[PDB]
Amino acid sequence: PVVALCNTNTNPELVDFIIPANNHQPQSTCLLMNLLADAVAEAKAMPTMFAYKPDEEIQIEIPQKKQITSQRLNITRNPEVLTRE
Amino acid sequence: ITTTKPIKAHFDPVADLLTKINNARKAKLMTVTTIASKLKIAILEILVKEGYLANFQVLENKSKTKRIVTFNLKYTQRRIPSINGVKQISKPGLRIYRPFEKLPLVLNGLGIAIISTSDGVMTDKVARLKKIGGEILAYVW
Amino acid sequence: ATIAQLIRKPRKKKKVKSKSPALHYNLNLLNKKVTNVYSPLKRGVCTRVGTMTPKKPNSALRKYAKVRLTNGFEVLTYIPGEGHNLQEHSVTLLRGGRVKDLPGVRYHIVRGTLDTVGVEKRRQQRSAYGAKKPK
RNA sequence: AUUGGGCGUAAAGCAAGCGCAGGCGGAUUGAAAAGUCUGGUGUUAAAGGCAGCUGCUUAACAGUUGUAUGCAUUGGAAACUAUUAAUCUAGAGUGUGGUAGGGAGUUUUGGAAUUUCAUGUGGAGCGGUGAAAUGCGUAGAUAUAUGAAGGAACACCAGUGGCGAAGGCGAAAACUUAGGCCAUUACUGACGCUUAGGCUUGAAAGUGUGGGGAGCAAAUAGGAUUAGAUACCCUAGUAGUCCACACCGUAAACGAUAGAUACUAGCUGUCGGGGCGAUCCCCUCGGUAGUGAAGUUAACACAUUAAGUAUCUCGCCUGG
RNA sequence: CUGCCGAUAAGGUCUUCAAAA
Ligand SMILES: [Mg+2]
Ligand SMILES: [Mg+2]
Ligand SMILES: [Mg+2]
Ligand SMILES: [Mg+2]
Ligand SMILES: [Mg+2]
Ligand SMILES: [Mg+2]
Ligand SMILES: [Mg+2]
Ligand SMILES: [Mg+2]
Ligand SMILES: [Mg+2]
Ligand SMILES: [Mg+2]
Ligand SMILES: [Mg+2]
Ligand SMILES: [Mg+2]
Ligand SMILES: [Mg+2]
Ligand SMILES: [Mg+2]
Ligand SMILES: [Mg+2]
Ligand SMILES: [Mg+2]
Ligand SMILES: [Mg+2]
Ligand SMILES: [Mg+2]
Numbered sequence: 292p293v294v295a296l297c298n299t300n301t302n303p304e305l306v307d308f309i310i311p312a313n314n315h316q317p318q319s320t321c322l323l324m325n326l327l328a329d330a331v332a333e334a335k336a337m338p339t340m341f342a343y344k345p346d347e348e349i350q351i352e353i354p355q356k357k358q359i360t361s362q363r364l365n366i367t368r369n370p371e372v373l374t375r376e
Numbered sequence: 377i378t379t380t381k382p383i384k385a386h387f388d389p390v391a392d393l394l395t396k397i398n399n400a401r402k403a404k405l406m407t408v409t410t411i412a413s414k415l416k417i418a419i420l421e422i423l424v425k426e427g428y429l430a431n432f433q434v435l436e437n438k439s440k441t442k443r444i445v446t447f448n449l450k451y452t453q454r455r456i457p458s459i460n461g462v463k464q465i466s467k468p469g470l471r472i473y474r475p476f477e478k479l480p481l482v483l484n485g486l487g488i489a490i491i492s493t494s495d496g497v498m499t500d501k502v503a504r505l506k507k508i509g510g511e512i513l514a515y516v517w
Numbered sequence: 518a519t520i521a522q523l524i525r526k527p528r529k530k531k532k533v534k535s536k537s538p539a540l541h542y543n544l545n546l547l548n549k550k551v552t553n554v555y556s557p558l559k560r561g562v563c564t565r566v567g568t569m570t571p572k573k574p575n576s577a578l579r580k581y582a583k584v585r586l587t588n589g590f591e592v593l594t595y596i597p598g599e600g601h602n603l604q605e606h607s608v609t610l611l612r613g614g615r616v617k618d619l620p621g622v623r624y625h626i627v628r629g630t631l632d633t634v635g636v637e638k639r640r641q642q643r644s645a646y647g648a649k650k651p652k
Numbered sequence: 653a654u655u656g657g658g659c660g661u662a663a664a665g666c667a668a669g670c671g672c673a674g675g676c677g678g679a680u681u682g683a684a685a686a687g688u689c690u691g692g693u694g695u696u697a698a699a700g701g702c703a704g705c706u707g708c709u710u711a712a713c714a715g716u717u718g719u720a721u722g723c724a725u726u727g728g729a730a731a732c733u734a735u736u737a738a739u740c741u742a743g744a745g746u747g748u749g750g751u752a753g754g755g756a757g758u759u760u761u762g763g764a765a766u767u768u769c770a771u772g773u774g775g776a777g778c779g780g781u782g783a784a785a786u787g788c789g790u791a792g793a794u795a796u797a798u799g800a801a802g803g804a805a806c807a808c809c810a811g812u813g814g815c816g817a818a819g820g821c822g823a824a825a826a827c828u829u830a831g832g833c834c835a836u837u838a839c840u841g842a843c844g845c846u847u848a849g850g851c852u853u854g855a856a857a858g859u860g861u862g863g864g865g866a867g868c869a870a871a872u873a874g875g876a877u878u879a880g881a882u883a884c885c886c887u888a889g890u891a892g893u894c895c896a897c898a899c900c901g902u903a904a905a906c907g908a909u910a911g912a913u914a915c916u917a918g919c920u921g922u923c924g925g926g927g928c929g930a931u932c933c934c935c936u937c938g939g940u941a942g943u944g945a946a947g948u949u950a951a952c953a954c955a956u957u958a959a960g961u962a963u964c965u966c967g968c969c970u971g972g
Numbered sequence: 973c974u975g976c977c978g979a980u981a982a983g984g985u986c987u988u989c990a991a992a993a
Contacts (some may be wrong), residue, residue: 492731
């Protein structure tokens with residue numbers, strides 16, 4: 292079994308437990324990644340981090356380095372494969 | 377029920393439906409549309425009795441001058457169809473007429489053979505029961 | 518192709534040709550016409566004995582013969598064996614075959630049958646070369 | 653290879669088009685019953701065929717009973733095809749309204765550039781090559797400035813482009829003219845696809861007659877190179893390349909992929925019509941490209957413009 | 973940075989084998 296956070300560009304056949312989500316945002320990823328970790332920690336009998344939790348304890352910050360921009364650009368770095376004769 | 381696209385169909389009436397079914401199965405599509413004819417309507421009725429398609433609805437225009445049948449395929453929960461392969465026998469040009477003694481059995485009865493003898497389209501088993509044969513439209517298994 | 522196309526021009530089968538054509542021609546002599554009647558083996562008369570060289574891999578001296586059969590066809594027939602009594606003018610009873618070394622030769626002389634002698638000093642596979650059982 | 657094969661790169665899609673006969677062919681209603689199915693009767697000589705049995709010591713064999721196939725006639729079935737009598741518009745056309753084009757022919761017009769000639773200035777080479785030599789030049793060449801004559805082809809625009817069935821089409825204008833795309837509350841009402849035979853067009857070379865000839869150059873002459881050079885290089889150079897009218901009908905005439913019809917993920921461009929109204933960009937309907945999964949292929953690869961799932965028709969292939 | 977630069981007699985080995993350890 293393999294679970295994954297597909298982000299609209301993945302073949303759904305390969306994954307089993309698909310989890311529709313983002314993958315480019317340093318906030319969505321962490322929330323979801325901790326959530327799976329949270330299941331494991333509860334099964335292992337250690338306290339949870341994000342799951343089954345109110346607003347004040349789920350709050351997370353946006354890493355450094357208006358709204359956040361989840362735009363895919365840098366298309367100019369895809370020219371035609373060198374050809375011609 | 378309303379549409380948005382123009383509906384066209386081929387001139388040959390058995391393989392037109394057959395192409396629609398085969399393309400939808402391979403492309404995993406479910407709902408398709410085509411023009412409605414009485415031969416095409418009758419073959420779809422026996423198909424749903426045999427349990428190869430789920431629903432089959434024939435419709436007419438608001439003027440009563442055109443009819444188009446829009447059928448859907450019967451996919452299981454895991455999304456694999458019930459139809460495995462379709463092949464037409466009595467193609468245009470060469471029409472196939474076989475007597476009762478030579479009525480074919482498709483995949484030892486697993487598939488169904490469409491035979492329109494004298495009372496419209498008719499399955500192979502019931503054709504054998506009445507001991508009467510005739511035009512053979514297509515093989516479906 | 519198409520049902521209509523084949524109805525107009527049906528499927529014509531490819532022909533079949535023999536490997537020993539000269540053995541299936543019979544000349545009547547009273548009318549001088551040649552009919553095509555198959556015959557296993559035929560009698561002829563030799564015209565020129567000698568030797569030929571094989572194609573490429575093989576290297577040797579193989580004894581050929583230009584024998585004219587009871588018909589009017591001249592065929593080069595290999596004398597299959599070690600040693601021959603052919604004397605340029607003689608009668609032979611040719612059979613079918615095709616030696617691969619010499620190009621053009623497509624017949625063999627049945628040994629030890631008519632004027633041609635048998636192949637003595639042979640104890641193996643004699644029934645084919647024609648030698649009396651040592652006994 | 654009807655059952656039972658193929659035509660991009662292995663044999664095989666005619667160069668393309670207009671197309672009669674033939675084949676195939678939208679939907680609904682009525683009749684007939686030619687195909688189609690079925691019942692009855694007649695017949696399909698005997699031997700042989702298959703099954704069972706008997707008789708030869710069993711067998712081979714002989715006899716014995718059974719055992720189909722087709723044709724005709726008669727009585728029914730009416731789903732499909734064919735025939736006939738009619739209705740409908742969705743296929744295909746026509747008209748109105750938008751509209752893009754190097755689509756074609758005929759007749760005129762224009763400027764650079766080359767060559768030749770005319771007139772000045774000028775004074776020793778120019779030209780050509782790997783290096784040179786034929787060749788041109790004190791009869792003043794090359795060069796420079798002006799002018800005249802003549803023929804051929806139409807820089808830039810010019811394209812990750814447009815048009816035509818193909819060959820092909822690119823300076824400007826006039827006349828004549830072909831097809832195409834989009835929207836149609838209009839009209840006819842299956843009039844449609846393919847096409848043996850037939851007809852039309854068809855790059856360049858070539859032919860016949862009459863013009864034209866600036867440049868270039870098969871054939872030819874000379875100088876080089878070379879062991880030799882009838883070739884690659886150079887200097888000359890006729891037919892030809894050009895026009896009008898008559899033929900020839902072949903090309904790697906290639907997308908090496910016949911035409912028509914319906915369906916099958918998506919993404920990025922670009923062109924035209926339409927909808928909105930600065931462009932730009934969004935949507936719809938089409939043409940032309942790239943990438944790309946299912947699918948196909950021997951592999952390369954094709955992939956909504958198929959070589960994919962299927963049907964119709966024509967042409968073609970059967971080892972070297 | 974384009975000179976020049978042509979030829980090479982015939983036929984031939986070599987994989988025995990996995991039954992298995
Ligand atoms: Mg083959
Ligand atoms: Mg070929
Ligand atoms: Mg072609
Ligand atoms: Mg060809
Ligand atoms: Mg046409
Ligand atoms: Mg016709
Ligand atoms: Mg019909
Ligand atoms: Mg009989
Ligand atoms: Mg007998
Ligand atoms: Mg001048
Ligand atoms: Mg020409
Ligand atoms: Mg000379
Ligand atoms: Mg010259
Ligand atoms: Mg000439
Ligand atoms: Mg040709
Ligand atoms: Mg590709
Ligand atoms: Mg041959
Ligand atoms: Mg040298």
